[PDB]
Amino acid sequence: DPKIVNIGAVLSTKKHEQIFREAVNQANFFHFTRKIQLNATSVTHRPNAIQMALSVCEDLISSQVYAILVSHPPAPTDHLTPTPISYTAGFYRIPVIGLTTRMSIYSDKSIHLSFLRTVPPYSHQALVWFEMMRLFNWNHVILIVSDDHEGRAAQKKLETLLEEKESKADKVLQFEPGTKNLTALLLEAKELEARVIILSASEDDATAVYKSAAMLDMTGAGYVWLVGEREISGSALRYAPDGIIGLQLINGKNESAHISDAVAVVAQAIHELFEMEQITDPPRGCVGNTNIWKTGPLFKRVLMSSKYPDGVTGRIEFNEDGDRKFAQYSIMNLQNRKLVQVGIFDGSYIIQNDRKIIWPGGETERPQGYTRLKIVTIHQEPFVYVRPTTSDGTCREEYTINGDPIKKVICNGPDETIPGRPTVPQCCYGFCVDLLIKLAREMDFTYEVHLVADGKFGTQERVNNSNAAAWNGMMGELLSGQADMIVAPLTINNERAQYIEFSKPFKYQGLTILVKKEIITGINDPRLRNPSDKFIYATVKQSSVDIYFRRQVELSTMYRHMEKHNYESAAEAIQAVRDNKLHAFIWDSAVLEFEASQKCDLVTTGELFFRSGFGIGMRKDSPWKQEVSLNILKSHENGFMEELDKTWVRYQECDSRS
């Protein structure tokens, strides 16, 4: 026997109702009519919400609909005019499928739990932006949203996309709808370094946004705009800036394609459904039924999982919220103040149409995106060199062993040459300097460098009450802000690490000992373990090695022997061994090995212990370090560092002596 299974819908016009019934009949014809048949019922949109809800309970549900389809009316009234149905069907858990509601507020399962759609919401558009952001490599952007479920949802979605990556809130900007003047907020926006912008708002709001934005000339080049379908359309189109990037969903305007496809999916879902048993018909009529329909959630479950990838609208699959997946958008450009398709986006991957890219203002191609750094250093021979600028004249044309001219920069630092100690203008050239300028070409930043007043890099010290003062030295300048970033040969350790962010290591090295070759078993040397007043072992007080000695309990006994006869600076420490004043010297290899090459009268011995790395200091709060490490790694992969160590480590004359 046949069984007539009703379906119901609310559509714009009677012609579309006929289209609906036609699609339904196509579903009946093409699937078993012996077992089951599908029947179609529909109604035009009503002027208020109430006439329509009454229509659902009376005109539709009296027909025992297994599901309802809904479309946006010819003249949109307020927004989300298909709000009532999702509630009304929802009471009985009758699944609802919207054709034209791109509105985001339906994505929350909590409020609308029966709601599914053949179109993705405006929030899901962010999928494009992330992919867009992905291609062009701008990690830094700005987001401008209206304040409502729509804008906040868009923000949540994009941020969630970013969450997989290091979370990126470069900046976020919230404004409230209906506000004609937005100027102040954009004034706040300009201060943010990131030069790329993305916005979501209503057409009327967007007019005000572009109107305010043009006043501050943010529509200019070096700035990028990414936007929603609504923004490019309407009055907003009229006031829209040139070179903007824009989105349009495919078949968004058409109900009918979505009709044929939605009904096709419904049919597949039902035919898949009746394969299951313990089914119940939906409640007959609104009247007399206070109870939900147990099947409805199941119908939703199959319908969300219902495949049928081939469809008039494109691929069909449904996300958790019941929102559509893998929808296709067509990117749009404002060229010559007119809409053009620069490319089209389908699936998870963007597609580039043959048309030339446009950016705002004049660009043949211009993907541009994203002011001072005070840098501090210490006098360490291998990675930094100090000579004063000759008179007023600046720096020597002196050349590396590989024929290249040596680069150099000006640095203000402590001078012991005068009896009093003036902060003296000086010329400094180094491995770290070449690295810094390498970054400076890579990075938007500009650099001015002055050496720290204290010869020490840094160590915690001074007064007892509370915690008083701060670690003396360049590090202290970093927290103080005297220098915002520290470029030097700094070992990286946890005690320091809590206070500040650390760049990924440019170099990898460990402590070791220098002793003259010409006639120390381990990091643990019985000879160290058997200290002698006769056999000295020397270090610098306040050198990080000393922090290793103080902080570590296990060797804490051994520290004191080292503490005796300490030297103030690196040159004096090497000299003592050279002068033979001190039989042994202990320091990290990166500074030491270069010297080992430099003399060969002296040698390094044993295995690098306290294995560590050297990195560039920044405050945790500063995001530039995120790029720095990102840059450091990029410098490692190409072998830039290897060639720089190859340049600055001479290796010329020395060997294993024995």
Partner: protein, 633 residues
Amino acid sequence: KHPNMDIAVILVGTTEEVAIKDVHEKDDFHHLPVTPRVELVTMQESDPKSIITRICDLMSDKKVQGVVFGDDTDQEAIAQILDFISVQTLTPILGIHGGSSMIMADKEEASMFFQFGPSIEQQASVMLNIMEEYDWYIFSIVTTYFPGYQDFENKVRSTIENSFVGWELEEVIHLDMSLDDIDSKIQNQLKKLQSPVILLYCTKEEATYIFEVAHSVGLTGYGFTWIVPSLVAGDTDTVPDEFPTGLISVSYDEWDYDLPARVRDGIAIITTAASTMLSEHNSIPQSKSSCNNIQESRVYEAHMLKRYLINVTFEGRDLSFSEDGYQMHPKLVIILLNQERKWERVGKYKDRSLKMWPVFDLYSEEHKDEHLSIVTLEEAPFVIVEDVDPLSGTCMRNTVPCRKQIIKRCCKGFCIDILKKIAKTVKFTYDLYLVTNGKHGKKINGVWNGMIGEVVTKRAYMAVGSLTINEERSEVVDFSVPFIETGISVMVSRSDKKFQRPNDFSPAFRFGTVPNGSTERNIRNNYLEMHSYMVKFNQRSVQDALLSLKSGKLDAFIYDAAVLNYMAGRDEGCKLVTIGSGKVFATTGYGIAIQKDSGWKRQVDLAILQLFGDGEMEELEALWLTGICHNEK
């Protein structure tokens, strides 16, 4: 001149056809400037169509400016429906009982709707007060996608963060009732949670399913207890026994004030708001009620009414609302499910403060709890089994008892002493026994063996011994930090690839190790040929392996470095020595088993290095580990 307002009220249910009509409205507090004009209507069972039609029908030309709704029903949905009408009409509506009183999604700000149920936030607060009263510190939350989630999760988060006490939130679960489950996905999650005190949040109907599932899971029993908001209990008149007994929940009391008194409160609120709005603007609140046409003009002006209506007071009683439309602090009662079907009150709670009746046990070391049995195996010097003096009948001196299922054996040695000091420091007591199957853990095909098995079977909490460390065992069980320097090593009389092939050397060479060892497994992992060759040279026991080395017929022996070094020091003649400096590859140390991420864990670790921290280990090394050989040094 005479300002008579127009008002309507409805009752549903009441368990009567001929539900008590117009019991109230009788003039009270007539002094209020506007006098109420009332039309009362009742309808038997709730529907979206029936309610919408009727309320609009009463609207007609009638022009009512306010509505109060009341129900016998347990239904969650009703409130939202009437709220929707309010959004459409801008005509105030509130409700005094049942579903309308039951919580709902956050109300649209423009919309006007009020409920005499408590705020979600307030309810969560009361749930917290209840847990604090019984001092149940540790709890989890099971929730559903129904509205108010995350307003609830947030409210709990806010309420919890502020308090000093070290309470624990264990898990939060969000499950969609939609996409109803074949998977029993709710069963699959719910099964996970181990916490004693559970807060549940959902629709009245959902609680039933979650509870049947909990009954399958075993969550309703024995020491676990559940606590519930207003919605699940609803009316409290009808209670499927699918709900477990001892279920704890808050609700408004019928006894304190009957439904007509509550309706009187509603009418009083509407007419008081009318009187105050009058006093402010001297303006009639009355407006055209008809929904079908566009909302009447100057009704848009109505917003201020809401602004006035939020807090209202009469009869020395405060009706003050919250931005959401729930009343700020209605009186509330703590209720429990008495045995059988009874809902019997336990507590009263009002305003800031709560009071509860029962003293104790409603419905052993303070610092720490339970007991730990330990398994070991005998190896010299570290763990030595000795036979106790039969005349004495029990163990002597340092020896601690250990039992082996096959008889009491007496264990003493390095593991016994280290364990003893550790037990003294962390202050716990423990049972020690000997392993039967496979000694130190061994893998045949898919399955583990040995002490590790008893650690996995939870027949042992911690395993102690000469056990070496490896990636696999560290993966399955947390290990203590190494107390001693040890590893693989060689012992012979007196990477070169001489080990790699015997065949390269024309005379046959020989080396072997004990099977089922971490050494043999490591060997098989890294070096196959060595394993496949050495299987012939494998020996029964370390004493026997020693027999193969000592009497000839074997050249080299390979074994744990600590044992080989102690044996280097201790030999009947100094006929045996270590390899090179005895500097061992696969540098490792003896660890100790634990179950998993949950364990006393770090507390153990500290204890261990305190042992070296006082220098005891050097003494213990000289006593137990030090051998006489290596005498020429």
